[PDB]
Amino acid sequence: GMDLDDHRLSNTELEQKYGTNIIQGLSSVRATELLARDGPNTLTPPKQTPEIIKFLKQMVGGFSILLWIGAALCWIAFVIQYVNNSASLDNVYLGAILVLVVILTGIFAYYQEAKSTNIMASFSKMIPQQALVIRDAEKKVISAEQLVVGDVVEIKGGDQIPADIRLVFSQGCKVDQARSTEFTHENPLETKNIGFYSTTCLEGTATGIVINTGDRTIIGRIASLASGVGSEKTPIAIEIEHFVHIVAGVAVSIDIIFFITAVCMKYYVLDAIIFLISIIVANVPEGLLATVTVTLSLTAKRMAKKNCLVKNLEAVETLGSTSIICSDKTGTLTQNRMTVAHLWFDNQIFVADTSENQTKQAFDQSSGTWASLSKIITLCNRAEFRPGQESVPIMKRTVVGDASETALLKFSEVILGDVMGIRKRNHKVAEIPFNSTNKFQLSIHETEDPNNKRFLVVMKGAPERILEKCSTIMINGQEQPLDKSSADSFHTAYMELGGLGERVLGFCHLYLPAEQFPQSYIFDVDSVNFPTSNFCFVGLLSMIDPPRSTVPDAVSKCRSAGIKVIMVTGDHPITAKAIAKSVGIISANNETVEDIAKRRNIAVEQVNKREAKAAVVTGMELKDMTPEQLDELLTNYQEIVFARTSPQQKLIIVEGCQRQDAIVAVTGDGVNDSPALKKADIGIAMGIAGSDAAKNAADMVLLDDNFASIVTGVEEGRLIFDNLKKTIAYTLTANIAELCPFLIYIVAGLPLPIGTITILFIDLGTDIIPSIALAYEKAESDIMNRKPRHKKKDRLVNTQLAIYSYLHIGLMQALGGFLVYFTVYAQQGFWPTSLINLRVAWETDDINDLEDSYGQEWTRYQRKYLEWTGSTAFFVAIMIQQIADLIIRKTRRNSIFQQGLFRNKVIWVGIASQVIVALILSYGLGSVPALSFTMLRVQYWFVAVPHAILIWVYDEMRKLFIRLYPGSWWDKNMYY
Amino acid sequence: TGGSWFKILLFYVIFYGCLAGIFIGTIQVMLLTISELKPTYQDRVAPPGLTQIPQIQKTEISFRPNDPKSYEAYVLNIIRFLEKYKDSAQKDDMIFEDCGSMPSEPKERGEFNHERGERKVCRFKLDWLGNCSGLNDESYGYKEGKPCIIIKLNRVLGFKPKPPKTYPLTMKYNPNVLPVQCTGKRDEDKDKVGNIEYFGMGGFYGFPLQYYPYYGKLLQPKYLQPLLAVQFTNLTLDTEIRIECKAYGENIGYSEKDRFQGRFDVKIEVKS
């Protein structure tokens, strides 16, 4: 529709713009017409594909085109063979099973994005939602479906806004944001006079006019306009596309080389055509989508168990590539359970017991300075104890207020007596709730003293801004102006009380004169009325905010794994730095430019900035820079603490960080952080203490409201890529040991080492279950010692992985199979050098007296049976050479002695499946000779074992020098 | 680069020369358990097959007597095999041994080792194959409507046939003769096969047992099999006739999947 919302206009012209009325709304004859013009206003998900195109797309896609080409080649081969008047029907079974494979992969794909969707559907947050309200002047119950432009709606707190309206009448309504009747901000999201559909309404009565419906709404836009939104490819989809391209290129190159060899060397078209289908059925990983959709579900369950409630799929795929984290201080990095331990008044430092005090304060309670401070602390506090539970100690009692308020309540109740009576005596008319923007909690009290001052104003807030608005200090019950000896004393006290990593609060009070202010007065929030400056500052409250226990380990693991951590707290650049140094964000042996200037005993500007690695920059500091300066600050300096920063400036921080080819993961818990929680690659909503707007705008939700969850989400986001490189390598290993036999059969003329159905049985039986068994593997020891993966530079299947799968382990699985093949043939009469150039005579149905190396004469069916036994021996050899090819693929840098052979018990299921399938195929399907299988003697199972105790030794000694000699051309070259 | 390619082309020389040295170093280890005299196992060749010499292609003998070229290959292929049984190629006495003209017990020439070295074969004479030896008729019967096939039992090393202890031959001599009987495969072929005349050694229709056991191309080169020649002296003209020949014994086995194990099937057609 349009990109602009009509909100600047006043009520008189807001009535004209869309034809509405402020009070009476519109009559039925006009409201019905407007509703028909606009339509219904509801949020539904029902749009979905007609699903016929979806079945068609899942029918052929990626690997399916190659396999369909192979099936067509197989049918062509059968018809060509039938031209020669011979029909062994082996191609019919191969083609039927090959098509059945695609049918089953389509069935498994329909199973996919359904169980994953069911897992996906569970990761979602509700808000109390209802669409019933009484509105439109006359008190009538009108459904939300009848709300349209021209109709006024009166709303009440405790539900969601029935429609996207522009508020015209309201009385101090609040949403999660103040609501008023006056235009405040140009942006409709923060204009403070527009209601948002499906957004909670806290309290108060508000009246507004609908301005958008359906597609016209900001949230909806093209919701009802169909089209495709959200179909962006996940990173694993890109990796799978690259893998498909690599596989197709390799297969095409091999086929072209063989065809150009066969065209001139007199190989008839049937051999070439059957070699192409062999190549197609061999070099195509069939059971890959199953082990791909298993891994993501398993990792989602793992993180959900690790308090990491990842909602989207792009989030779980992209989490392991995190490079920059912009976390908060209170909440994520601290226990958020403050304890009062230090006191400051009369320019002195007074200590107190953090917990289990069980006694009164050490200092005297009759001091004139302490009496007023304690009285104001008790009065200024808003925290209240948990009702109905006045038997548990003070600590166990719960408050729905701020944690700092709980701290002052805990101090006051254990130091002073009853506070309810004092608050009742100091009757309160109006009170300004504490907010992050104002950073003070203003209150209005009526004086009950004999001197009828009748006006008492008490507030608390940040000590720096408190004293910046104060011009006097109080000592020994006597007021005195704030001289330099008091300002410097306050600065020194703040530095000392922030050095240990504790936040402090200021306190003030004032009584208005009776002559200037009469007994009867009216208080307005907007109007200044009572003065709010030059109050009576009393003292400071020091409260300890200890970081959570697991946080330092997480910050050290981030340093080890090369993940940058940034703090975006809004506190003083001294306390933020002092707590960052404690949690490890600003590591030891690191010095900001101010501290290195102090050490050099010279001014800051006389110090080269490169001599400093840390940065504690205030909010105004980055408010004053152009984006280039912010980019160079984020580039040149390692550890950055964005202290004293606005919550909105998280936008600037995140958008500056993202311009460095890095993946950012910001953590916000407020509706102010939601625009920054959306721009971030992985927006994170604080778990226990968080707002639903953040939990809706975040790509990932915590459940432990703690750091070290954001890092244990990365540690299992990396496990996806670690276990996929182990699943795409074991599969590719046995791919050249299935087409080398046919190459030698064509060239050297040996009888067929392995059939075409056999190399498909290998893929179906010993390539699926062991492939899934490698997706359950645990993490390595170097998973948190590796730099974050680059989305463009790094690939799931690099050149080294494919070269090691094909040219290293695939060539050792063929030499072991050929040994068993030659053993089977040589023990029945045909010596190894007697088999060269024998295929022409071997496959002639008319030669029933072929002479072996001992002079005996073999009929055709006995040669056929010996060939079947030789192929069964090759199949068994590559079932046992892929048991030591699944043990050595559980690691890429470690050994089995450290990982443990019995720690992952699905590897044993995969091994037992291989053994059971190989025993069924040779003794159950070989008792009646069918599908080129025959019973195998007991020796022909253990012949390939010595070649399987070689693949393991070679890989163990390959990884041993990787571990011993990092970055020594061995880690550089021989490391997949 | 230009200098680090020599370090990657040198690892793959040593690694692929070590894989080859391990593959060859295990094939020669397996071959140490393989004797040069007798096969390790006789599992596929143990029950000997039975085949005809003309090496006819599709189990079909079709020719026309008045066309010297329809049976030209049939007659010319018997000559190639019977050349080694020529009486002029058996004159040497350092190799050939003259057994009797009557069947006797299997002739044991020793043990499967290097004692006595080369072993002496027993000579077979063509003129036992009357009307089919080619000593009188240059074409082996194909000039007229009398096809003549020559039956031979596939050589199995160390195998001694045991004749049975069908119809009795009426010239039994089963202690030293393995019976062979050719009959029509179907009733409409038994009615049309006509008269079948066998030509074996000493007038006995079978393989004499004195040519067994075979000793295997190293102890016994120049080894001559016993042959049985079968002539169909009177069969239906211009018809495809199916004929099945079987060797009877207790060593001899028959299989439903191997059509040439102890048996063979040949379709004889004579056109006019």
Ligand SMILES: CCCCCCCC/C=C/CCCCCCCC(=O)OC[C@H](COP(=O)(O)OCC[N+](C)(C)C)OC(=O)CCCCCCC/C=C/CCCCCCCC
């Ligand atoms: C990319 C593909 C990877 C997988 C490839 C696997 C190999 C596939 C090749 C097949 C071709 C045929 C291989 C033949 C092997 C012969 C083994 C050998 O050594 O027999 C030596 C022979 C004599 O044996 P015999 O029959 O008398 O023994 C009978 C037993 N007894 C001793 C009691 C008499 O000597 C002679 O005949 C000398 C005259 C003939 C010489 C032929 C030489 C052929 C050698 C080929 C080795 C190639 C190795 C490739 C490695 C690639 C690694 C990447």
Ligand SMILES: Nc1ncnc2c1ncn2[C@@H]1O[C@H](COP(=O)(O)OP(=O)(O)CP(=O)(O)O)[C@@H](O)[C@H]1O
């Ligand atoms: N109810 C209340 N009334 C007055 N001041 C309060 C208050 N609750 C907290 N404060 C002030 O807030 C400060 C505590 O900081 P806080 O932990 O809220 O920072 P923060 O976590 O909101 C920054 P961010 O959200 O970016 O992580 C104290 O110095 C205190 O003076």
Ligand SMILES: CC(C)CCC[C@@H](C)[C@H]1CC[C@H]2[C@@H]3CC=C4C[C@@H](O)CC[C@]4(C)[C@H]3CC[C@]12C
């Ligand atoms: C089969 C035998 C003859 C192969 C001989 C050529 C071999 C040694 C050559 C051909 C292609 C080469 C590879 C081509 C590309 C890559 C990727 C690069 O980042 C490192 C080198 C590496 C990994 C090369 C290693 C050596 C290599 C495998």
Ligand SMILES: *[C@@H]1O[C@H](CO)[C@@H](O)[C@H](O)[C@H]1NC(C)=O
């Ligand atoms: C076939 O042999 C018989 C004697 O058994 C003989 O009378 C006849 O002439 C022979 N025929 C030919 C074509 O040699």
Ligand code: NA
């Ligand atoms: Na494979």
Ligand code: NA
């Ligand atoms: Na495989």
